[PDB]
Amino acid sequence: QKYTIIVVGKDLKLVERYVKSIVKEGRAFGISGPCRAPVRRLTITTRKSPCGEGTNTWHRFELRMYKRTFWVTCGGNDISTILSKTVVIPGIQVTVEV
Amino acid sequence: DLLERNDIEVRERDKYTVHTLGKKKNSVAVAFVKAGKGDILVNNVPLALVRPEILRTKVSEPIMILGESLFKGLDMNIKVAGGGHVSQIYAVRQAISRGVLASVKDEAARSELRAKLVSYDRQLVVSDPRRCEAKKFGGRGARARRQKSYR
Amino acid sequence: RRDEENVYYSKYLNDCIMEAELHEFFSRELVDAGYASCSLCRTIDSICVIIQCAEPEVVMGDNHYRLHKIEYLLAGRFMCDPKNFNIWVDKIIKRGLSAEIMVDNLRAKLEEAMPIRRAAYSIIRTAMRAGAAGCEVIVAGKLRAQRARANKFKEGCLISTGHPKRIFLAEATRHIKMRQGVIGVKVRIYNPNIRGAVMPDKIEIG
Amino acid sequence: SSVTRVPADVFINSFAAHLKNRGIIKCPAFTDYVKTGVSRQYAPRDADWFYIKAASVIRHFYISGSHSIGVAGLARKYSSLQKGKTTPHHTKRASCKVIRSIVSQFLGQKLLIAGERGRHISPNGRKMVEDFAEGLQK
Amino acid sequence: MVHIPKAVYKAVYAHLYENASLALKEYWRVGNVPGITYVDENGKLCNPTYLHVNCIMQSLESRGVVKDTFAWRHHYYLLTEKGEQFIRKELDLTDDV
Amino acid sequence: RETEFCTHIAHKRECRICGNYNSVYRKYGLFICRRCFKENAGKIGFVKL
RNA sequence: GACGGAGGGGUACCACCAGACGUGGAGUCUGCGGCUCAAUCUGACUCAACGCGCGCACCUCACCAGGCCCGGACGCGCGGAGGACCGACAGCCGGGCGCGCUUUCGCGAUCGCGCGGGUGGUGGUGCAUGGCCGCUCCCAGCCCGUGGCGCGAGCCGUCUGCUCCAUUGCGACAACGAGCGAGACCCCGGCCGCGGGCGCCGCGGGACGGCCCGCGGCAGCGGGAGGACGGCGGGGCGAUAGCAGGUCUGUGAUGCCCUCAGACGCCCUGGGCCGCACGCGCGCUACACUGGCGGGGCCAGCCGGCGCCCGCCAGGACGCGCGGAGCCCCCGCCGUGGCCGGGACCGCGGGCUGGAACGCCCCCGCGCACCAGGAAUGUCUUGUAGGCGCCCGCCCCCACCGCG
């Protein structure tokens, strides 16, 4: 059975290692090539000032969300083996699907 | 319409041998040459029929620089997606010239068609990047700011 | 080629704002144990918080039940399964180098009413000893007067601008409360030796 | 290819004339006293407008190839801006009831097929669009 | 003066005594706290009013049964030892428990 | 006072942190004060650049 | 140190030059002033106030006209079980809510009262403050340690030279070494690979004043070339010392302070911020034919849903996952006429959103000024000005707004 895997990482460097680990754990289970979802840019522009006094300077805050595409043809136990096998780094999105 | 897998998705089989591109002002064009009877079509529309009627001459400049012999055998299929009307005619010209260059690229004869075309018109071969700038706060444009009331 | 309604992104957002609510609860909860960095990773409805801290003993304690009661409190608040909320507290090296501990220590030292210059001068020493080349302490407010002023006591060279500033500085802001009024203390600690890389302009040429 | 080689506007005007003689469409009563679009405040002065529009809907469906898109998509193709406001001008879509009443009429005459969702040019209709283009070619 | 129900008073006390965890989001009269269920005299397990519960939250704070660490518009209460003994007496519960 | 208290129904969207009912900025589902967001957007991971 | 209608050097479209396209003059929009009202809530006023504090029917909301209610916690003294507290049928009053009254059914210590101490507040003071921004500050400035110099305050370094854009360098010197700011970094872009796939997106190189020629110790200067790219992009971060600049009305940031049970607490209803002789600031639409008209072609990007019928529309019913501008281009038409420009106001209707228009949308009307704008002024040099559309924020509805 083939299971869909999606990983969302805010920091590109933190997901960069995770994608390298994903190939080095599921190679026998034939993990899919890591297509990268186009960045989802969460953008908030807020006036920098607590008040509205002074020039209207704007504070731009952006969270870039990166996502990767993975599929593994393996047993029900085998995805769980890769889920334990992949490098665990904190604050990551883990997806198990059918 | 922006740099997707659209480049090869339009045609299945009918393999084209020479691939070329022409991209300016966000208008990107992918040109595929099967080297048949020499006819050129852009976006399913024959190159001799171009939507701007004055800008058919701009599109037919690569063809005007070299003799009929070069285009006698080069069958080009072009696909321009995105950008704008004028950025699409400008893109077409760049792609047609990349197609002639790709036919004679291995020989030192690539130099002859690059010199003649470029000398008559710059950007026939090259593509001037000139991308659009970003609006900044306090203005309606990158170089334009709102009128100042006092002083 | 897809339906653009992926809610994975929205879930990611609610874990970030959970840490952000936690970061503030832990600040009220553990000013005694020097709460500092917090991260959260939940794999499959597991939930694990790594609180890098100055001291984990007040957080944990006998039977690690103080930690457990805090874990229950958040399991109830975030409506997660009770006891499913799990936290591991780690002791941090170079207590002086992390300024969230140093600013916390200063604010509480200032309360005992010690000399304000002496307070900063003692904190300045423990950061330089911990290795920070740049140490900056600024206390501002109505200090020993009915008028505002800012008193910067600084030992060493600190970068103040640019991309290195974001990763090579430890600015921590705390708001002391006093009968006169709030006299906020700000401590910024700069480490060129951050081990994450080198200063962009530092040419070793050895 | 065939109709694509022909200038689409030239083909649209010539085919609309053919559709009227061929009895295709047969314009409804409401179309004489109606102005296409919420943006246009003036009715078309062409008097053959419901035929010129009907060449546009069926030939644009030929351009769909296999899309099977609906009436609102075609309405967007003929949309323009609403003026007459102190506020700046904004694009408003064409009136759907006119567009619905030609795509339904074309399917009713079997020139179009409702495969799923909207409509794509029927094989019987596919000959008609190519046929007229061949007449234009010579 | 609020006629706070004894059932709602005891169930909240047990929830705090057992979990040392009560989290009360700021709320007005409308709405019901999620996580507490009380027996009606009509024999029904229900959800208690946020207002009555709020006065229980304030009675335990004014007793000293809890420690307040309010953050981000959410109250945070941990049971205190002096309160731990007190809750047992009201709930008719034992020290060994 | 059961009828009087809170008879009127309306959205009362406020910042999660402050409770102010103005500038809620729920653009991405964040019920966040614009002034309060300025205070704590670093933990949410938003970066200035 | 600051000033000079002092001298010499630089330098910047928030300076000018050559220009551009505007404003000011008209109609409207929004803000500000005044005026007026029960209230028309307020901040604030040269740059650095004036569509600014991110969409006021209600809520917001702070203002006003009312109307409930306590949510005064705990302690202490005192009171309390057939009752501490309270809740309601009808009738009436009051828009109305056993609010309250006539009254008479319920109800259960949850607590009544006096004192200490709460409790809140968009009440005040930003001349008590923190934090945060604005501005000084298209500006390169700031500064130890040791040595020198003066009784010292203070100088020297930290420079009357030449170069940069730049305390950018180079060269010389009672300085000699540093440091921070500059720069560097970072974010994107255009280019070229290496891999990957549902998604064009992960990782790297590529440009450095190198090369050529002149000129200068030099720093560098000005041309050429070679190349996507050439010599401060298009951003972010922005030292030091400050300003009684602004914000206590963003908050469980806050002192002092004020109210606190007929509350300056909170809810509920109705109004106000949008009232208009008038002055001004930011805008939007104009003044037509380099146009309106409107029948087709047709291309977007931040990035993105549609189908089927019903309806002139506006919308709606019904199901499903889908899917893309204007300008311009051609062809008609009107023909220099306040006209076929302009759409401000007004009168019938038809929808929508909500609990409610007093909101918006549309259809038929209606046809105000306005025929290129005085003194003044405002921002700009490549994908730039301008023209032209679109998206989101705040949003129930709604953008002439902001950010894109």
Say how far apart CA D3 and CA B44 lie, in whole Å. Answer: 10
| Alpha-helix residue ranges (DSSP H) falling in chain C | 8-29, 57-60, 65-77, 99-111, 116-129, 163-168
**Cβ contact D50:D57 at 8 Å:** no
Residue with tokens 């909860």: C29
Q: From the C1' of G14, which residue's alpha carbon is nearest?
A: B148
Say how far apart CA B24 and CA B80 lie, in whole Å. Answer: 11
Do the domain assignments include residue D63?
yes
* B 27-86: CB within 7 Å of strand G: 27, 43, 45, 51-54, 80-85
**DSSP annotation string for D68-83:** -B-HHHHHHHT-EEE-
Closest alpha carbon to C170 in C157, C184, C186: C186
Tokens of D39: 């943006």
| All residues at 6 or more sequence positions from C78 whose CB lies less than 8 Å from its CB, including other chains | C18, C85
Closest alpha carbon to B62 in B91, B29, B28, B83: B91
- Bridge partners, residue A36, by sequence: A68
Amino acid (1-letter code) at residue B148: K
**Cβ contact B89:B50 at 8 Å:** yes
3-state secondary structure of D43: coil
Tally of domains within chain E: 1
Residue with tokens 């994903």: A22
Say how far apart CA C99 and CA C120 lie, in whole Å. Answer: 12
Nucleic strand G under 7 Å from the C-beta of C161: yes
List b or e across B32-58, with b for residues whose CB sees 16 or more CB atoms inside 10 angstroms.
bbeeeebebbbbeeebebbeeeebeeb
Say how far apart CA F47 and CA D9 lie, in whole Å. Answer: 51
Which approach determined this entry? cryo-EM
Do the domain assignments include residue D137?
no
Say how far apart CA F7 and CA C3 lie, in whole Å. Answer: 41
Nucleic strand G under 7 Å from the C-beta of F43: no
Say how far apart CA C14 and CA A71 lie, in whole Å. Answer: 26
Closest alpha carbon to B110 in B123, B100, B96, B122: B100
**DSSP annotation string for F19-45:** ---S----SSS----HHHHHHT-TTTT
Closest alpha carbon to C34 in C66, C58, C50: C58
Give nearest nucleotide to D34 (CA–C1'): G312
Amino acid (1-letter code) at residue A71: W
Say how far apart CA C83 and CA C69 lie, in whole Å. Answer: 9
Q: Which of F5, F6, F17 sits opposite E72 (nearest CB)?
A: F17
Tokens of B117: 């075309």
Say how far apart CA B73 and CA D117 lie, in whole Å. Answer: 43
- Bridge partners, residue C172, by sequence: C187
Three-state SS annotation for chain A: CEEEEEEEECCHHHHHHHHHHHHHHHCCCCCCCCEEEEEEEEEEEEECCCCCCCCCCEEEEEEEEEEEEEEEECCHHHHHHHHHHCCCCCCCECCCCC
Q: CA dist A5 to A82, C70, D54, Å?
A: 11, 34, 49
| All residues at 6 or more sequence positions from C192 whose CB lies less than 8 Å from its CB, including other chains | C133, C134, C168, C199, C202
Say how far apart CA A30 and CA F19 lie, in whole Å. Answer: 51
Say how far apart CA B86 and CA E94 lie, in whole Å. Answer: 86
Strand G bases near protein CB (under 7 Å) are 14-15, 22-23, 27-29, 43-44, 46-55, 58-61, 67-75, 85-88, 97, 108-112, 122, 126, 128-135, 179-191, 195-203, 228-229, 234-242, 244-247, 250-256, 266-269, 281-286, 292-315, 321-330, 332, 342-344, 355, 361-365, 378-386, 388-390, 392-396, 399-404
Tokens of B77: 């299929």
Nucleic strand G under 7 Å from the C-beta of B123: no
3-state secondary structure of C50: strand
Question: How buried is D28 (Cβ within 10 angstroms: 0-12 exposed, 13-18 middle, 19+ buried)?
Answer: middle
**HSE-CB for C96 with a 13 A CA cutoff:** 18
Give nearest nucleotide to F2 (CA–C1'): G97
- Vertex B15 angle, CA B103 and D131, to 5°: 110
3-state secondary structure of D138: coil
Among E2, E30, E50, most F C-beta atoms within 10 A, so best to mutate, is E30
Residues of F with CB under 8 A from a CB of A: 25, 27-28, 30, 34-35, 37-38, 41, 44-49
Say how far apart CA B92 and CA B47 lie, in whole Å. Answer: 9
| Alpha-helix residue ranges (DSSP H) falling in chain D | 8-22, 49-64, 71-77, 96-108, 123-137
Closest alpha carbon to A61 in C173, F32, C6: F32
Task: Sort out which chain E residues have CB atoms less than 8 A from C24's CB and list them.
Answer: 71-72
CA torsion, points E49, E50, E51, E53, in degrees to nearest 10?
Answer: 90
Calculate how close chain C gets to A57, using CA atoms only, in Å. Answer: 19
**Cβ contact C120:C176 at 8 Å:** no
Which chain C residue has its CA at the smallest distance from E72's CA? C21
- Bridge partners, residue B111, by sequence: none
Nucleic strand G under 7 Å from the C-beta of C141: yes
How do beta strands C86-91 and C48-53 pair? parallel
Q: Verify whether the Cβ–Cβ distance B44 to D1 is below 8 Å.
A: yes
Write B103-109 long-range contacts (CB < 8 A, 24+).
Answer: B103/B18, B103/B33, B103/B35, B103/B70, B103/B74
Say how far apart CA D78 and CA D109 lie, in whole Å. Answer: 23
| All residues at 6 or more sequence positions from C71 whose CB lies less than 8 Å from its CB, including other chains | C83, C85, C86, C87
Q: Count of C–E CB contacts within 8 Å?
A: 48
**Structural domain boundaries, residue E39:** 1-94
**Cβ contact A25:A93 at 8 Å:** no
- Bridge partners, residue E79, by sequence: E66
Backbone angles phi, psi at C36, to 5 degrees: -130, -110
Closest alpha carbon to C56 in C82, C77, C30: C30
Do the domain assignments include residue B61?
yes
**Cβ contact D87:D31 at 8 Å:** no
Q: How far is the CA of D97 from the C1' of G311 (A)?
A: 8
Q: Order of strands across the sheet with C48-53?
A: C35-41, C48-53, C86-91
Q: Which CATH class is domain C99-190?
A: alpha beta
Say how far apart CA B34 and CA B18 lie, in whole Å. Answer: 7
Q: Count of B–D CB contacts within 8 Å?
A: 6
* D 94-123: CB within 7 Å of strand G: 95-98, 100-101, 103-104, 107, 114, 117-119
Question: How buried is E3 (Cβ within 10 angstroms: 0-12 exposed, 13-18 middle, 19+ buried)?
Answer: exposed
3-state secondary structure of C57: helix
Say how far apart CA D102 and CA D51 lie, in whole Å. Answer: 10
How do beta strands B40-42 and B76-81 pair? parallel
**Structural domain boundaries, residue D73:** 2-131
Q: How far is the CA of C97 from the C1' of G231 (A)?
A: 43
Which chain D residue has its CA at the smallest distance from B50's CA? D7
Three-state SS annotation for chain B: CCCCCHHHHCCCCCCCCEEEEEEECCEEEEEEECCCCCCEEECCEECCCCCCCCCHHHHCHHHHHCCHHHHHCCCEEEEEECCCHHHHHHHHHHHHHHHHHHHHCCCCCHHHHHHHHHHHCCCCCCCCCCCCCCCCCCCCCCCCCCCCCCC
Say how far apart CA E71 and CA D56 lie, in whole Å. Answer: 63
Closest alpha carbon to A30 in A68, A72, A85: A72
Q: Which of F16, F17, F43 sits opposite C16 (nearest CB)?
A: F43
Write E46-50 long-range contacts (CB < 8 A, 24+).
Answer: E48/E5, E48/E8, E48/E11, E48/E12, E49/E8, E50/E24
Q: From the C1' of G28, which residue's alpha carbon is nearest?
A: D86
Say how far apart CA C107 and CA C137 lie, in whole Å. Answer: 12
Closest alpha carbon to F40 in A27, C73, C22: C22
Say how far apart CA C138 and CA C154 lie, in whole Å. Answer: 8
CATH-assigned architecture of domain C8-91: 2-Layer Sandwich (3.30)
In this structure, the number of other CB atoms found within 10 A of the CB of residue D88 comes to 7
Do the domain assignments include residue D138?
no
Give nearest nucleotide to B5 (CA–C1'): G200
Say how far apart CA E5 and CA D112 lie, in whole Å. Answer: 71
Do the domain assignments include residue B1?
no
List b or e across B67-102, with b for residues whose CB sees 16 or more CB atoms inside 10 angstroms.
eeebbeebbbbbbbbbbeeebbbbbbbbbbbbbbbb
Tally of domains within chain B: 1
Say how far apart CA E86 and CA E92 lie, in whole Å. Answer: 10
Closest alpha carbon to B93 in B53, B122, B70: B122
Closest alpha carbon to C70 in C28, C42, C98, C106: C28
C residues 47-76 lying closer than 8 A (beta carbon) to A: 48, 50
Backbone angles phi, psi at E27, to 5 degrees: -150, 160
Three-state SS annotation for chain E: CCCCCHHHHHHHHHHHHHHCCECCECCCCCCECCCCCCECCCCCECCCEHHHHHHHHHHHHHHCCEEECCECCECCEEECHHHHHHHHHHHCCCCCC
